[PDB]
Amino acid sequence: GSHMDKNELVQKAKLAEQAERYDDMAACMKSVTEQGAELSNEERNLLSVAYKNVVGARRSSWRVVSSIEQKTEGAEKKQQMAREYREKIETELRDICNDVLSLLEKFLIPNASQAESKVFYLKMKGDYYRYLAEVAAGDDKKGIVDQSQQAYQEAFEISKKEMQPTHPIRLGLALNFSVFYYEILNSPEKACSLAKTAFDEAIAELDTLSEESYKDSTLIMQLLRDNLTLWTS
Amino acid sequence: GSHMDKNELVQKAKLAEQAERYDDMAACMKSVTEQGAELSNEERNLLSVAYKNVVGARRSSWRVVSSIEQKTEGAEKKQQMAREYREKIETELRDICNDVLSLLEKFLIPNASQAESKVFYLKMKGDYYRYLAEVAAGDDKKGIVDQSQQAYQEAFEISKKEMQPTHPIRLGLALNFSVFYYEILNSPEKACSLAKTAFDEAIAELDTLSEESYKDSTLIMQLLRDNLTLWTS
Numbered sequence: 001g002s003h004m005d006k007n008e009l010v011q012k013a014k015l016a017e018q019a020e021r022y023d024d025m026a027a028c029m030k031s032v033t034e035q036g037a038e039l040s041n042e043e044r045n046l047l048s049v050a051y052k053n054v055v056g057a058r059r060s061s062w063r064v065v066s067s068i069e070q071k072t073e074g075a076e077k078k079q080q081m082a083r084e085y086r087e088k089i090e091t092e093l094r095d096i097c098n099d100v101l102s103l104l105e106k107f108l109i110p111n112a113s114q115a116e117s118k119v120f121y122l123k124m125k126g127d128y129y130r131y132l133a134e135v136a137a138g139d140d141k142k143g144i145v146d147q148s149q150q151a152y153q154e155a156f157e158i159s160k161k162e163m164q165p166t167h168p169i170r171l172g173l174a175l176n177f178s179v180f181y182y183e184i185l186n187s188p189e190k191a192c193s194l195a196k197t198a199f200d201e202a203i204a205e206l207d208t209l210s211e212e213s214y215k216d217s218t219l220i221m222q223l224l225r226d227n228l229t230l231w232t233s
Numbered sequence: 234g235s236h237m238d239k240n241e242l243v244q245k246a247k248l249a250e251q252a253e254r255y256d257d258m259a260a261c262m263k264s265v266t267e268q269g270a271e272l273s274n275e276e277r278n279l280l281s282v283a284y285k286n287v288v289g290a291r292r293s294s295w296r297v298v299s300s301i302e303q304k305t306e307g308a309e310k311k312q313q314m315a316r317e318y319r320e321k322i323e324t325e326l327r328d329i330c331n332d333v334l335s336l337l338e339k340f341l342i343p344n345a346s347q348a349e350s351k352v353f354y355l356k357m358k359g360d361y362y363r364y365l366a367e368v369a370a371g372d373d374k375k376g377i378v379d380q381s382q383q384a385y386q387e388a389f390e391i392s393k394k395e396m397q398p399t400h401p402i403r404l405g406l407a408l409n410f411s412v413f414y415y416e417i418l419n420s421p422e423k424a425c426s427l428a429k430t431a432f433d434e435a436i437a438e439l440d441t442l443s444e445e446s447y448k449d450s451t452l453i454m455q456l457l458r459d460n461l462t463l464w465t466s
């Protein structure tokens with residue numbers, strides 16, 4: 001009401017980024033978001049990046065430890081040691097995902113004015129439930145995986161009607177929705193199906209591309225391409 | 234005495250490294266050092282690697298924020314935000330160096346038999362006091378600097394009486410020692426002379442490089458020349 005300076009938070013969030021201190025950066029944007037004000041494209045970018053870094057570092061640590069755990073199964077204490085370290089990391093992963101999901105469902109998504117940013121948050125929602133999914137105990141895994149799917153799906157509809165096939169975010173949605181299908185629902189089928197499509201529909205309008213993102217669209221289109229054959233191969 | 238196994242901590246430390254969680258890694262190696270045993274060659278590497286990464290990130294952020302704390306000034310408001318963020322980072326930085334300095338002065342240096350490690354720890358000592366010197370205030374800055382120089386100085390002796398001009402640790406000692414004179418005591422004079430002399434003495438016996446550390450010896454020499462080069466203008 002007078003206790004928060006939403007503008008200084010953004011500067012500080014921007015300062016934490018330069019300093020490569022993303023936990024701090026994420027802490028500032030979470031706080032900017034809770035002020036209830038619909039985010040500007042720069043702020044949305046600052047939020048996405050911060051949390052991308054914060055959650056991403058853990059997802060990468062998890063994988064490394066998730067491996068060492070297996071490839072060191074023979075022994076007990078050792079493997080057993082790696083298992084606890086992994087659980088320590090999953091607790092961190094969850095706290096991060098519950099927070100982004102909470103901001104996403106209570107502040108961002110409901111106040112998305114434009115369709116472009118609505119799809120973007122819906123996509124984030126899909127990504128973060130997916131992160132919870134990758135580390136959920138079989139019992140809760142079903143419900144979670146479903147949260148992800150329906151979030152991506154809802155973003156996929158909105159995009160398939162308000163956004164051009166070449167728009168970076170729509171393409172980005174297809175990129176991760178397709179990954180969700182290959183890595184989560186372990187369905188190389190539905191996967192490839194979506195990644196190839198979204199790619200053609202982009203090509204069909206390669207001229208609809210703009211210098212405003214011709215470098216971004218194709219960039220993601222290369223990732224869609226790379227993954228695509230990476231699976232067929 | 235039965236509450237913590239040194240070997241399991243080391244494995245904990247290596248696991249953390251693989252997952253690139255250096256703070257966890259440093260905490261493990263700190264525990265290993267406190268176990269009271271002179272460190273092995275592997276354990277020493279794990280310690281310096283971990284702390285180099287932990288303090289490195291802070292020094293790095295300290296600079297990014299300090300430099301931005303300047304490009305401001307005119308904005309007393311933003312300047313305060315920057316300044317406080319700098320102090321926060323300083324407190325972290327200062328805590329890390331304090332711990333390392335404590336480990337070195339209490340457990341490591343005192344129980345360093347082989348003249349190699351002793352020089353390595355004595356050097357680490359000069360380095361960490363140097364890090365403190367960079368963020369110290371005029372008041373106590375002198376004494377701190379006085380601590381950096383003394384630690385390097387004695388390390389410089391033992392080396393130039395036990396290590397060849399080509400041994401990596403001796404070369405490294407000369408590099409940071411020369412970086413201290415230039416960056417800290419502000420005098421490229423004694424800085425270049427020390428760097429250039431550590432280099433000339435290297436090549437003099439150039440064909441003394443062992444396949445085991447020629448690349449290592451080489452990397453230190455390039456830096457010595459590059460730094461020296463930059464000090465030549």
Ligand SMILES: *Nc1nc(C)c(O)c(C=O)c1COP(=O)(O)O
Pocket residue numbers: 052127168169172173175176216220223
């Ligand atoms: N989702 C997404 N959107 C945009 C605009 C991109 O350029 C890219 C890739 O560069 C992606 C895929 O993003 P990640 O969530 O995997 O970082």
Ligand SMILES: *Nc1nc(C)c(O)c(C=O)c1COP(=O)(O)O
Pocket residue numbers: 285360401402405406408409449452453
């Ligand atoms: N001091 C030092 N020693 C050794 C054995 C090295 O290989 C290197 C460089 O890789 C150095 C310089 O180390 P920093 O204190 O700048 O990380």
Ligand code: NI
Pocket residue numbers: 001002003004
């Ligand atoms: Ni207020």
Ligand code: NI
Pocket residue numbers: 234235236237
């Ligand atoms: Ni014990």
